[PDB]
Each structure stands twice: as structure tokens, then as C-alpha cells.
Amino acid sequence: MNKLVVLGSVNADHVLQVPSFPRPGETLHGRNYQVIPGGKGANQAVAAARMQADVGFIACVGDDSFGINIRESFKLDGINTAGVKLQPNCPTGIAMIQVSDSGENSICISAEANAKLTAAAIEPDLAAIRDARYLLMQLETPLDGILKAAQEAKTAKTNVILNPAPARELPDELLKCVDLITPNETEAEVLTGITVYDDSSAQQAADALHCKGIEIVIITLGSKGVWLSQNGRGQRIPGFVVKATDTTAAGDTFNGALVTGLLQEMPLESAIKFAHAAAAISVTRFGAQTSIPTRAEVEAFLAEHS
Amino acid sequence: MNKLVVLGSVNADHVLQVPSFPRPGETLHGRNYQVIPGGKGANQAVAAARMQADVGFIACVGDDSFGINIRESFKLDGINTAGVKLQPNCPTGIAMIQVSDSGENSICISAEANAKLTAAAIEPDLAAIRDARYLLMQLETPLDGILKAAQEAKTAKTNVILNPAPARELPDELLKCVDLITPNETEAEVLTGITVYDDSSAQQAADALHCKGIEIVIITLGSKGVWLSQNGRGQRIPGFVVKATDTTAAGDTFNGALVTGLLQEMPLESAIKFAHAAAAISVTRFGAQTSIPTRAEVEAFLAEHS
Ligand SMILES: Nc1ncnc2c1ncn2[C@@H]1O[C@H](COP(=O)(O)OP(=O)(O)O)[C@@H](O)[C@H]1O
Ligand SMILES: Nc1ncnc2c1ncn2[C@@H]1O[C@H](COP(=O)(O)OP(=O)(O)O)[C@@H](O)[C@H]1O
Ligand SMILES: Nc1ncnc2c1ncn2[C@@H]1O[C@H](COP(=O)(O)OP(=O)(O)O)[C@@H](O)[C@H]1O
Ligand SMILES: OC[C@H]1O[C@H](O)[C@H](O)[C@@H]1O
Ligand SMILES: [Cs+]
Ligand SMILES: [Cs+]
Questions:
Q1: CA-to-CA dists, residue A83 to A126, A155, B234, angstroms
Q2: Which residues surround ligand 5, an ion (CB under 5 A)?
Q3: Nearest residue to A20 (alpha-carbon basis) of A97, A106, A95, A94
Q4: B1-306: what CATH class?
Q5: Catalytic annotation on A172?
Q6: Residue A305 burial by Cβ neighbours in a 10 Å radius (0-12, 13-18, 19+)
């Protein structure tokens, strides 16, 4: 029984660099086309697995070549893929990601196989959720699946970490089941209404989540580190200073590394700093999973930062 | 030896249906992810083939499963794929395509294997070009290769029809060997500077190209049909009005049909009218080659319309 169970999405990132932002009409010449394994659930389970967590993964992929292959690849990564279903006659979820040389990114996502991860779909996964010490989830799969998983986890005294990404609002009923939540600045706002300008707001944002029943709130702040509140007692834990070139799986990495630290009986504060280190590395590399570091790369990183 | 030689591109079309077109800093949600036989070169060769032209295709495909597979498919449409090269360790040209409800599309292409259709690369194809009476090309393959073809055509009584798509500027050495050019409105603008907004501007653009050596100009105007000019004598030839499902390959289908009609001794005006019918049927259907009509379909449509 995996001590960590990650539930979440799988995309194929079709990345293309384009000179201008895409507009309808004339065929625009792109370049450096790649298909990168992505998806917030996949990226986080890959994060944890690469941080050597005892991790199983609940997800829905397609029966295209990509879905068939990425499942095998997860195995190679050390992820228990028992909970990874292949959806008949569905492509795998895809992100059509056009990186514009003029900075501004064009993103077109289609759920595809991901829309299939329903509360009923995860039924055989429930037991793995009960036996886990931690359940990690995001929001790139249907809500009923996410909610069903958290509920199962509360009664089993499994700890529930929710990375509320991508940004979307959530019912009290799910928040109440979440032991630890890790929104970024955008997502805390969406979830609370409270926009996070500084410590005061971050703490109000946090307290709003504490009142939704979430003991621990971690608001990731981009380069500003993290705002950690545990039972009202808040504090900013800063991250590392790196030349950021792509932050695509940054948040995915942080959550994977964070939960792996806690499973190693790290104090929360230390687990967090550890996760900072992993995510920092990732923000320095291109693409989703292509940027997610190993435990070795992290220890190496931490050593080099003294 | 084929009477018509089409030289141009092959792409896998990665196609998403979108509610609308994406705003710069925002995540579009798409659907019906599909990978579709495409590329202007293939589209027009497929179009001429289906119009029962005697057509050989000069193109480059990759050695991925897609390129191997599509080249075979070309045979099934009666295309002589002798000149269709398989390029090792290169994926096939791709297009990332979003099609909205309106039938509008944004297309981003990645050349990939198409970048291998060089002048040197088409050396074995020069005989087919000389022995043809018609050479039809577009612009998704290297310019040096397009140029070379146009030149070998003129030495051996071979009419050149250039379809200057996607929009880019062309050297005069190319244009003066073009017997008949078929820009859309964006391309006409890019080629002459003269935006085409009406009858007069349509003629300004056209005579610009006549002073580039091109005897016959055809400016396509979407649903407004085309503008036809034979040495300073322009006129608008209306297309047929259809509801647009997807307009990906309307112009490709038009070019394919047009050249075939001409080839089969339809007077210039009849060939255009013929081509209009093919293209109008095509904009009613989804995806690139998936939408290209049969000859019987076009006759039927022509018998209906009339
Ligand atoms: N706007 C987006 N840009 C890039 N990837 C996205 C986006 N939205 C969802 N994804 C999916 O989730 C993963 C990236 O995480 P994300 O949180 O979007 O990064 P960011 O820090 O830019 O918000 C990718 O693998 C991709 O498949
Ligand atoms: N520019 C950066 N420099 C260093 N670390 C970063 C940077 N951006 C993100 N991080 C790290 O990535 C983690 C993810 O947080 P955040 O960037 O808010 O998520 P997301 O990028 O998904 O919005 C942060 O807690 C931090 O550890
Ligand atoms: N909405 C439409 N209805 C009918 N025919 C069309 C339509 N759009 C394009 N065509 C046909 O395709 C040819 C060129 O169209 P094009 O300029 O490429 O339009 P678009 O770029 O919007 O597809 C014309 O011959 C015309 O017959
Ligand atoms: O003309 C439409 C075609 O142009 C682009 O090259 C795409 O592949 C698409 O299929
Ligand atoms: Cs990254
Ligand atoms: Cs079409």
C-alpha cells in the first residue's frame, strides 16, 4: 500500500514555438514542435516518484499511442500505475501550447481522457486512498472524482493535500476534507476572493481556508517563496533564487517534493524548504515533466546552496 | 509521365475544436482532438487526384508512423507518389489547428520533414516536371525547391500554377516563371503590398503580378469567390455559397480542381467555376484532406447549381 497516492490529470503537451501570438486567418510558421508528457497529476506524481516517494497514481489516459506509452513510462519512474486507467477510443488529454516569442503564451487544453476520471472511475482506487498516509490531488480532472477521493481519505485518517490547480472554485465539502492546501496566488484568490498582496492578505486568505476546515495552508508566491499558516500561525518561508525560464511544472514539482518530505517525517517547515529546492530546479528547465528534478538533483542543489 | 505535377507539403494536422479563438493570457478549452491528413501540397494533389487529374506528387514525409502511412494513402487517391520522399529521423510536418464553430481556423505549421524538399532533393523529379503540362505548387516547402521546379517547367512547355500560400514574399525569378498565381487576400497583399478589398484593388494587385510576368492571376476571396485577370482585363467570378464547417483546405481544393479543369481543356472561366464547386463542397466538411470532394460530387454539385 503506497504511502502516497497522487490523483490527477495526464496531458500530452504539444508545444510549438511561434513568432507571433496565433490569430485566425493565414497559416503561421511555427518551430521546435515537441510532444512533452504533461498534466498536473502526472507532473506531481512524477515529482514525488523522482523524490523517491512511495507513490501510487490515480489517473485517466487515452488509448492513443501516447496514453499507452506514458502509462509504461510512469512505471519506469517508480509510480504505482495500478490506478491509471486507459480510456477506450479517447485521445489522451492534450495541451496545445504555443509559446510566443513575444512572450505571451497560447494555451489550448482539451480534457479528453481526463474527463473520464469520475467518482465512479476511482472506485477501485478507494482502498489505496484509505491505506495511504497522504493523498495528493489537483484540479485538472472532474471534481466528483476529486471530492470522492478526499471524502474516502478523511474517514481513513489519510492526510489530504490539495493543489487547487488549475484555478477554480471549490465546495466547502471538499475544502473541509483538505488537511493541507497549496494554492498559488491566483488560486487562493479564486478560492477565497481574498487577493494576496502581502503577508496580511496571505494570512487572511489562509485564515479563510482555515475556516473552511483546512489546518495547514501554504500559498505559493512565485519567486516570493511560500506563505505557511498552521492553525492561524503564519509565516513566510522564502524559496530559492534561480534564473526562471519556464515555470510550467514549478507548482507541480513543489507539491510532489513537499509531500515527499513530510512522508520522510520532516518538520513541515523543513519539508517546505525542501520542496522550494525541487521547484526551483524545475523553473530553470523547459517543459512539464522534462523539467522535474530527481531527489539526487535536489540534494545536489541543496548542497550547492550550502 | 503525369500531365499534372503537384509539388508541396505534407502535414499531420493536430486539430482541436474550440468555442472561440484564444486570448493571449488565457487558457482555452478545446475538444474533438484529431490528427488529420493535411498540408497544402498534399491537399491540392489529393484535390487534383480526386478531380481525376493525371497527377504526380513531389513531397517529403517523415519516418514517423504518420508519414509512412499518409504517403501510402496518397496512392489510394490515384496520386503518383514516386516523388514523395520519406525523410529519416524527422517527424512529418505538423499543423496545430484550432477550428471554431464559424468554420474559421488558426493554423500553426512546423515544417519538419517538409524542410527536406530542397532543390537538390527534387533533382530526380525534374523529368516529371518537364514532361508535365501542368506544375502546381504552394509555399510550405523550401523556396529553393519551389524555384527550381518553376524553371524546369518553363523550358519544356509546362504551365506553372503557383499557390502562394502560406503568405510570404517571393523573388521575381520565381514569379516571372509563374503562368498562373492564386493568392488569397492576405497573400496578394504580402506579394504586392496592395491590399485587396474590392474590384479595383483586386485589379491593382493583379496587374502588379502581371508586371511580374504572370499572364493569368486569380485572387481568391473566400466566400466572395475569386478575382480573375488576363493581362489587364480583370473580373470577379463568384463561387458557390455554403455554410462553413471548416475552411481548412478550401483554397487547396480550389487550386487542385482549377488546374485539373484547365488540364482537361475547360476554358479558363469553366475551370474556375469547376474549382469553385469543389472548394465550396470542401468548406462544408471538417479537416484538410478529409473534406476534399470526389469528381462525381463536384459534377453533381455543378448539375445542381448549374
Ligand atoms: N496555462 C498552462 N500552461 C502550461 N501548461 C498548462 C496550463 N494549464 C494547464 N497545463 C497543464 O498542466 C501542467 C503545467 O502546470 P501549470 O500550473 O499550468 O504551470 P503554471 O505555473 O504556468 O501555471 C502542464 O503539464 C500542462 O499539461
Ligand atoms: N521564479 C522562481 N524562482 C524560484 N522558485 C520558484 C519560482 N517560481 C516558482 N518557484 C517555486 O515553485 C513553487 C511553485 O509555486 P508557484 O510558482 O506559485 O506555482 P505555479 O508556478 O504553479 O503558479 C514555489 O513554491 C517555489 O518553490
Ligand atoms: N464560406 C465559403 N463558401 C463557399 N466557398 C468558399 C468559402 N470559403 C472559401 N471558399 C472557396 O475556397 C476558395 C478560396 O477560399 P479561401 O480564400 O481559402 O477562404 P478561407 O481562407 O476562408 O477558407 C474559393 O474558390 C471559394 O470557392
Ligand atoms: O491549407 C490547410 C493546410 O495548411 C496547413 O499546412 C495545414 O496542414 C492545413 O492542413
Ligand atoms: Cs518548467
Ligand atoms: Cs474543410
A1: 10, 20, 66
A2: A 246, 248, 291
A3: A106
A4: alpha beta
A5: no
A6: exposed
For strands A11-18 and B80-87, give the pairing: unpaired
Decide whether any atom of ligand 2 lies within 6 Å of the A256 Cβ: no
Radius of gyration of chain B (CA): 18
Q: How was this structure determined?
A: X-ray
The CB-side HSE value for A227 (13 A sphere, CA atoms) comes to 23
Chain A residues whose C-beta is within 8 A of a chain B C-beta are 14, 16, 18, 21-33, 65, 91, 94, 96, 98, 100, 104-112, 166
Q: At A240, give phi and psi (nearest 5°).
A: -100, 160
Residue A32: strand, helix, or coil: strand
DSSP for residue A51: T
Cα B237 to chain center, whole Å? 19
Residues of B in contact with A33 (CB under 8 A): 91, 94, 96, 110, 112
Do A32 and A76 form a contact (C-beta atoms < 8 A)?
no
Distances from the Cα of A129 to the Cαs of A57, A72, A138, B108, B278, in angstroms?
Answer: 10, 22, 15, 43, 58
DSSP A238: -
H-type alpha helices, A77-178: 126-131, 143-155, 172-175
**Quick one: which of B54, B68, B167, B161 has its CA closest to B109?**
B167
B-chain residues within 8 Å CB-CB of A14?
Answer: 14, 96
Cell digits of residue A149: 477521493
In eight-state DSSP terms, residue A105 is P
Point out which residues pair with A108 in neighbouring strands.
A96, B28
Domain ranges (residues) in chain B: 1-306
